[PDB]
Design a protein around this ligand. Structure first.
Ligand SMILES: *[C@@H]1O[C@H](CO)[C@@H](O[C@@H]2O[C@H](CO)[C@@H](O[C@@H]3O[C@H](CO)[C@@H](O)[C@H](O)[C@@H]3O)[C@H](O)[C@H]2NC(C)=O)[C@H](O)[C@H]1NC(C)=O
Ligand SMILES: *[C@@H]1O[C@H](CO)[C@@H](O[C@@H]2O[C@H](CO)[C@@H](O[C@@H]3O[C@H](CO)[C@@H](O)[C@H](O)[C@@H]3O)[C@H](O)[C@H]2NC(C)=O)[C@H](O)[C@H]1NC(C)=O
Ligand SMILES: *[C@@H]1O[C@H](CO[C@@H]2O[C@@H](C)[C@@H](O)[C@@H](O)[C@@H]2O)[C@@H](O[C@@H]2O[C@H](CO)[C@@H](O)[C@H](O)[C@H]2NC(C)=O)[C@H](O)[C@H]1NC(C)=O
Ligand SMILES: *[C@@H]1O[C@H](CO[C@@H]2O[C@@H](C)[C@@H](O)[C@@H](O)[C@@H]2O)[C@@H](O[C@@H]2O[C@H](CO)[C@@H](O)[C@H](O)[C@H]2NC(C)=O)[C@H](O)[C@H]1NC(C)=O
Ligand SMILES: *[C@@H]1O[C@H](CO)[C@@H](O[C@@H]2O[C@H](CO)[C@@H](O)[C@H](O)[C@H]2NC(C)=O)[C@H](O)[C@H]1NC(C)=O
Ligand SMILES: CCCCC[C@]1(CO)NC[C@H](O)[C@@H](O)[C@@H]1O
Ligand SMILES: [Cl-]
Ligand SMILES: [Cl-]
Ligand SMILES: [Cl-]
Ligand SMILES: [Cl-]
Ligand SMILES: [Cl-]
Ligand SMILES: [Cl-]
Ligand SMILES: [Cl-]
Ligand SMILES: [Cl-]
Ligand SMILES: [Cl-]
Length: 849
């Protein structure tokens, strides 16, 4: 009766350390491990819920779940309602609720699946129809459903699972008794800790390269426990079970299906894709001006200048000091005149200690009741940068209106172009509030997940504090998201163009409103390597605008690290070099000449690829694609890709293989079956100063030369990449002529596309205010296909076409039937470089033979 294989034992004492006698008193089995694995675990006979009165609606199924025997947790809910909705052929949805009490809910020719049910103990069983494989089986363990404790378990189809941000972890999560805690927390990224965001979604790989996704729409603090059987357990501290299963079958389709629910990523302004430079310690407008001066002097592109707490008056939002920032508005106006943009930090917490009538944001907040309140109904007061602070309630409609006003009013003073929203966990320098926290079940729940500090209050506000929609206990994981939403709306109203919001704390669906950076990472090799899986993870979760502080934030960077970090960083979708107050400088211009070359080259390449990167974001926005993706998302059927997370793809075509260790002059990367052209063979122009031509892989690891000044970038055969000429800003580069890089298959074919708009307007797709072109290479010709042409893309000039993998030197190269003025061919590299005078918006035919 206690004969359960070790790896299939489910913890019967997740709440406390337990003795044998107590374990058996709970009706559980006690077997000590031989070396983690629970000593106290459920027998197959442990009391669960029983399914009864299962019936058939038009949507799917409904049933009653009854528990006869109470668990060891208080306030078991003995009668539940089951609703199974078969929403699409790709998406199955089921809820388990209390029919007697409305509980907290997060405010949001055949199907590929089939569903069965176990009667006793109750379980939901989901099969993939095509191959009969069990994806979900909740029978593996008892269902717990108490007021402050939900537990739902399932078998997993393989050892390969990804998701459940935000943690410093490999892309593929360890199934060796791993406890993953989702509770937004201000902590410098470290393994085994709950970090800034919570995304209750996983993608699971199945033998053969199929995949499915599971999303649990629950914003309460939770643990997810993985075991090697393999299996998974959700343990939430409130709410309901609201489960979506996405059937794929392709990993890309899983992501797309998940984003159908949580929302497709927002479309950033083009300039957002440029280089961002920031640090804490630009303490004046004069110093800040020097940063732009020094970058321009040394031919480093810079699109956006940022400021941290420096700009503020006494570290308060919506103010500027009259010392080093007396002429703040003029500085920002000047940046605009140069064709650049400005970003500055904004905290959620509002200074409450000022004299009445002297600080409008607090005074208005007080008047309108925008703050999170405590037991007696007064604002909850914590400590942050300005000192004593109240925290806005972003679930309050009135709070949203107040936030819009503060942003609009401040924008009238200083025309910033976006918002960097930090500390939105929300972060608190003290535990709970200045007045401590009350003694109640929200503050001391029966189950506390493995959060750092061992309490839900650590580094945040009281769980039992009041918001418009609910207690903080339920809403905590949404705090950052709600601020993102609030900020997104505020910037739209204030500016009338696309918002640019970068947020620290995030939740499922965050990517629809804002981007993210991975927080206070150390300037270390370890942290540089870790950023790749982290960036990839966020793409899978539909937050494609993500990156890490290039060169690292905490500690002092080295020259070598900063070179490697910039090399890889240029391939973060969101690229910002940011630095801490006490750190040594790490701006590109602050290093030696050889190092500057390497960095200049990385920034040059990025700027060249912006038209491509922008098109990739367009795909994310309309079709729920990823921008930076792991090999396994592009090559699921090659199981060698499954554990690759130190390389990344941009879209389908561009494979980046970075050096992530000190003193390395080579890198070993994995190349899926196909031909991969070295991007070094494509001519790229720069403003300042700055190997096999092709890899023919059978699906194998390849060692590549990787000297200090090189980052390995390969273009997949059969793909056409659009490029644009150089500039120090996107204002400049968007005016430059364009080029094509054409990577021919052995069969002489290739396909590509370009999306183009004004780069900042709202409702571009709805209004049709864009140009969309497809490029096709076939039978020794390159043509364009006009999907849509408007004034926006009309005057785009194509002046250069580079063809990779041309076997023999041509005798004639024609453009629209006339010999071109100039072309070159390398017998060595197999590259045909053609000069042309064409318009992206007019049909052309380039040919050779
Ligand atoms: C979903 O998971 C449940 C629980 O893991 C599975 O049901 C369980 O299957 C085991 C092992 O296959 C059963 O034990 C076996 O019973 C048979 C018939 O009496 C016997 O011939 C075997 O020697 C073995 O002892 C167990 O009774 C059963 N437990 C429950 C709770 O029903 C189920 O297989 C999974 N469903 C699918 C479709 O994978
Ligand atoms: C809910 O939040 C409010 C603030 O919005 C809390 O009010 C605080 O109450 C404490 C005492 O209960 C006050 O401290 C007092 O300070 C004076 C000197 O200034 C001293 O004479 C007293 O001995 C006492 O230490 C505190 O000033 C006050 N905070 C503010 C900003 O007014 C309230 O306690 C919170 N409610 C609960 C039950 O948590
Ligand atoms: C399972 O259902 C039975 C019968 O429920 C009736 O028919 C259903 C389709 C639904 O429309 C119900 O509202 C109906 O009552 C339940 O047993 C009945 O309970 C009712 C109301 O308390 C009682 O008056 C009758 O005597 C019962 N009828 C029969 C034939 O048993 C039963 O409680 C349900 N099970 C659970 C655990 O919810
Ligand atoms: C990061 O470096 C600063 C400064 O480092 C010094 O100056 C650099 C140019 C380099 O040459 C270093 O080797 C020098 O040590 C560190 O701040 C120093 O801290 C020490 C000891 O705590 C203190 O005695 C010095 O006065 C500080 N130096 C100055 C001029 O401010 C800082 O500690 C380093 N940070 C970390 C975590 O490594
Ligand atoms: C921008 O560049 C200038 C010039 O390189 C920097 O100012 C110099 O800093 C050195 C110390 O390293 C001082 O000894 C000199 O007085 C400065 N030289 C000149 C020509 O002024 C400046 O620090 C840089 N500013 C920023 C913000 O990076
Ligand atoms: C406690 C020292 C770190 C504070 C650093 C800052 C100051 O605003 N707040 C946290 C952010 O993640 C950092 O990017 C930011 O520079
Ligand atoms: Cl014991
Ligand atoms: Cl007990
Ligand atoms: Cl509620
Ligand atoms: Cl693994
Ligand atoms: Cl403006
Ligand atoms: Cl309400
Ligand atoms: Cl292998
Ligand atoms: Cl290897
Ligand atoms: Cl390079």
């Amino acid at each position: 009766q206690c004969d359960v294989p070790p790896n299939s034992r489910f913890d019967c004492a997740p709440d406390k350390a337990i003795t044998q006698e107590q374990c058996e008193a709970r009706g559980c089995c006690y077997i000590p491990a031989k070396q983690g694995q629970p000593w106290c675990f459920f027998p197959p006979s442990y009391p669960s819920y029983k399914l009864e009165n299962l019936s058939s609606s038009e949507m799917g199924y409904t049933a009653t779940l009854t528990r006869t025997t109470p668990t060891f947790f208080p306030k078991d809910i003995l009668t539940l309602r089951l609703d199974v909705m078969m929403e699409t052929e790709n998406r199955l949805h089921f809820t388990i609720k209390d029919p007697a009490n409305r509980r907290y809910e997060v405010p949001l020719p055949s199907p590929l699946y089939s569903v069965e049910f176990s009667e006793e103990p109750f379980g939901v069983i989901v099969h993939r129809q095509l191959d009969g494989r069990v994806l979900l089986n909740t029978t593996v363990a008892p269902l717990f459903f108490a007021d402050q404790f939900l537990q739902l378990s399932t078998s997993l189809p393989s050892q390969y699972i990804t998701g459940l941000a935000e943690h410093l972890s490999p892309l593929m999560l360890s199934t060796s008794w791993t406890r993953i805690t989702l509770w937004n927390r201000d902590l410098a990224p470290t393994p085994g800790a709950n970090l800034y965001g919570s995304h209750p979604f996983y993608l699971a790989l199945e033998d053969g390269g199929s995949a499915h996704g599971v999303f649990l729409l629950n914003s309460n603090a939770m643990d997810v426990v993985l075991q090697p059987s393999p299996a998974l357990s959700w343990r939430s501290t409130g709410g309901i079970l609201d489960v979506y299963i996405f059937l794929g079958p392709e990993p890309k389709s899983v992501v797309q299906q998940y984003l159908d629910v949580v929302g497709y990523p927002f479309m950033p302004p083009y300039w957002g894709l440029g280089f961002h430079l920031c640090r804490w310690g630009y303490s004046s407008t004069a110093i800040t001006r020097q940063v732009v001066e020094n970058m321009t002097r040394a031919h480093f592109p810079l699109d956006v200048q940022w400021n941290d707490l420096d700009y503020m008056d006494s570290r308060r939002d919506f103010t500027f000091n009259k010392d080093g920032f007396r002429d703040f508005p003029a500085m920002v106006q000047e940046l605009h005149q140069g064709g650049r943009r400005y970003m500055m930090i904004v905290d959620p917490a509002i200074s409450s200690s000022g004299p009445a009538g002297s600080y409008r944001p607090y005074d208005e907040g007080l008047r309108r009741g925008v703050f999170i309140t405590n037991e007696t109904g007064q604002p909850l007061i914590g400590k942050v940068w300005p000192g004593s602070t109240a925290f806005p309630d972003f679930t309050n409609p009135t709070a949203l209106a107040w936030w819009e006003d503060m942003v609009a009013e401040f924008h009238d003073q200083v025309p910033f172009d976006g918002m960097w929203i930090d500390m939105n966990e929300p972060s608190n320098f003290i535990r709970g509030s200045e007045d401590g926290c009350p003694n109640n079940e929200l503050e001391n729940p029966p189950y506390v997940p493995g959060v750092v500090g061992g309490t839900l209050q650590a580094a945040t506000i009281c769980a039992s504090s009041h918001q418009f929609l609910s207690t903080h206990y339920n809403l905590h994981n949404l705090y950052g998201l709600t601020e993102a939403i609030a900020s997104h709306r505020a910037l739209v109203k204030a500016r009338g163009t696309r918002p640019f919001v970068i947020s620290r704390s995030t939740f499922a669906g965050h990517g629809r409103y804002a981007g993210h950076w991975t927080g206070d990472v150390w300037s270390s090799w370890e942290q540089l390597a870790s950023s790749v899986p982290e960036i990839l993870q966020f793409n899978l979760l539909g937050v494609p605008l993500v990156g890490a502080d290039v060169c690292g934030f905490l500690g002092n960077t080295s020259e070598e690290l900063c070179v490697r970090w910039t090399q890889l960083g240029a391939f973060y979708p969101f690229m910002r070099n940011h630095n801490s107050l006490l750190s040594l400088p790490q701006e590109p211009y602050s290093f030696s000449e050889p190092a500057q070359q390497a960095m200049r080259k990385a920034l040059t390449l990025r700027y060249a690829l912006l038209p491509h990167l922008y098109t990739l974001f367009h795909q994310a926005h309309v079709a729920g694609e990823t921008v930076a993706r792991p090999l396994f998302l592009e090559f699921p059927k090659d199981s060698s890709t499954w554990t690759v997370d130190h390389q990344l793809l941009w879209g389908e075509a561009l494979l980046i293989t970075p050096v992530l260790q000190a003193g390395k002059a080579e890198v070993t990367g994995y190349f899926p079956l196909g031909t991969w052209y070295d991007l070094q063979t494509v001519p790229i122009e720069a403003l300042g100063s700055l190997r096999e031509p092709a890899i023919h892989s059978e699906g194998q690891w390849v060692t590549l030369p990787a000297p200090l000044d090189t980052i390995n970038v390969h273009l997949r055969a059969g793909y056409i990449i659009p490029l644009q000429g150089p500039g120090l800003t996107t204002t400049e580069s968007r005016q430059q002529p364009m080029a094509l890089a054409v990577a021919l298959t052995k069969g002489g074919e290739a396909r590509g596309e370009l999306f183009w708009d004004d780069g900042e307007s709202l409702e571009v797709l709805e209004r049709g205010a864009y140009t969309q072109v497809i490029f096709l290479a076939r039978n020794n010709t390159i043509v364009n296909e006009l999907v849509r042409v408007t004034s926006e893309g009309a005057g785009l000039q194509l002046q250069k076409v580079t063809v990779l993998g041309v076997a023999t030197a041509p005798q004639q190269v024609l453009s629209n039937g006339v010999p071109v003025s100039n072309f070159t061919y390398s017998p060595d590299t197999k590259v045909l470089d053609i000069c042309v005078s064409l318009l992206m918006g007019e049909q052309f035919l380039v040919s050779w033979c």
